[PDB]
């Protein structure tokens, strides 16, 4: 029951991961799915990677997010080393030592977006909306598709997520308060939250809304 994907690897690097996967009877694919159990990141000597879509989605889904070093060493040592020893530890944006991968790996109940209701008010670069939505969902939000489809009532907090500089004729992303009763955060709020596997506070992401 092992499926993995890779991120930020060169073709030569992919091949080692291949050769590796071949040896340990591991399924290896291009696309991350729910069945993926591992994500192999290009990292530096101490397990800091860059932030990629798969990075996000493998944290979101509580998967093994491991250094490519997991691979090269298991090869160097002619046996499969342990993931715990190669678990990526940080990224170049969210800090070197935060351990999102670990946090998320364990906290599959205490799920960072519990009882939030998010709306990815499109458009986004480098990321289909539904991936962003899948991402918040793996993290326990529920996805509203439409500004008006919020489920206000008791207990349930709404959030509109946007990517300001993804807009054509912009500042329309300032007119969203006039369309409903939700905080409006940058996508960075989601990405940092997910990196850190810990729900950030909106404050530094809040987009100010024109009444």
């Amino acid at each position: 029951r092992m499926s993995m994907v890779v991120s930020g690897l060169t073709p030569e690097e992919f091949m080692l991961v291949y050769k590796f996967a071949r040896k340990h009877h591991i399924t290896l694919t291009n696309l991350i799915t729910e069945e993926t159990t591992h994500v192999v990141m290009k990292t530096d000597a101490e397990f800091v990677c860059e932030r990629t879509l798969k990075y996000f989605l493998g944290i979101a889904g509580g998967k093994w997010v491991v250094s490519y070093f997991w691979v090269t060493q298991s090869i160097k040592e002619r046996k499969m080393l342990n993931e715990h020893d190669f678990e990526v530890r940080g990224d170049v944006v969210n800090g070197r030592n935060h351990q999102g991968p670990k946090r998320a790996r364990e906290s599959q109940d205490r799920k960072i977006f519990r009882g939030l209701e998010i709306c990815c008010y499109g458009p986004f670069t480098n990321m289909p909306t539904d991936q962003l939505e899948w991402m918040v969902q793996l993290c326990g939000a529920s996805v509203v598709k439409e500004l008006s489809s919020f489920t206000l009532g008791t207990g349930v907090h709404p959030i509109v997520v946007v990517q300001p500089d993804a807009w054509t004729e912009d500042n329309g992303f300032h007119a969203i308060g006039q369309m409903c009763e939700a905080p409006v955060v940058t996508r960075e709020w989601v990405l940092d939250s997910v990196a850190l596997y810990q729900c950030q506070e909106l404050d530094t992401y809040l987009i100010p809304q024109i009444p």
Binding site: S7, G8, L9, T10, K42, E50, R51, T52, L53, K54, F56, V92, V93, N126, M127, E188, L191, D192
Partner: peptide, 12 residues
């Protein structure tokens, strides 16, 4: 700065 495969999500 280079980028080797997948889009990267960097400095805010």
């Amino acid at each position: 700065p280079t980028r080797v495969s997948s889009p990267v999500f960097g400095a805010t």
